[PDB]
Design a protein around this ligand. Structure first.
Ligand SMILES: [Cl-]
Ligand SMILES: [Cl-]
Ligand code: NA
Length: 129
């Protein structure tokens, strides 16, 4: 599923991401835009043989099991394919664990490089929340 900007903002707000660990909704929408272009089916292979999955590009070395990242952990306790669903519940629940692990949203390279320090509220402007 390819979300619209406001559709995703509303879905994320319902799942508890607005101000989760102090990150306003605009941060999460900005990260999803540049991580996956709002596409739940996005996958990208990393150099080290791990793969990033879904709308927030969650990495198989630490967070989900894809059966092909040797010596990886599965801290979110899910198969990585669950992160590609049109239902973002699995992605959001895993993201809450990642952002709580000490490094905040710096875990997402695109957030660090393209959202951090910008006017992220622009990403929810005009939406009905
Ligand atoms: Cl915001
Ligand atoms: Cl933080
Ligand atoms: Na894994």
């Amino acid at each position: 599923k390819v979300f619209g900007r406001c559709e995703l903002a509303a879905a994320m707000k319902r799942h508890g991401l607005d101000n989760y660990r102090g990150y306003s909704l605009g941060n999460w929408v900005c990260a999803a835009k540049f991580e996956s272009n709002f596409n739940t089916q996005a996958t990208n292979r990393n150099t080290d043989g791990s793969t990033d999955y879904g709308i927030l590009q969650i990495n198989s070395r630490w967070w989900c099991n894809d059966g092909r990242t040797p010596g990886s952990r599965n801290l979110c306790n899910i198969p990585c394919s669950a992160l590609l669903s049109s239902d973002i519940t699995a992605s959001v629940n895993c993201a809450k664990k990642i952002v709580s692990d000490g490094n905040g949203m710096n875990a997402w390279v695109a957030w660090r490089n393209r959202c951090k320090g910008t006017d992220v509220q622009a990403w929810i402007r005009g939406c009905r929340l």
